[PDB]
Design goal:
two-stranded antiparallel ribbon; monomer; mainly beta; 2 strands; binds oxalate ion; flat
Length: 8
């Protein structure tokens, strides 16, 4: 999904 200030 997403993490911190990035999403994948
Ligand atoms: O958890 C995740 O998928 C990431 O940090 O990209």
């Amino acid at each position: 999904x997403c993490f911190x200030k990035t999403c994948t």
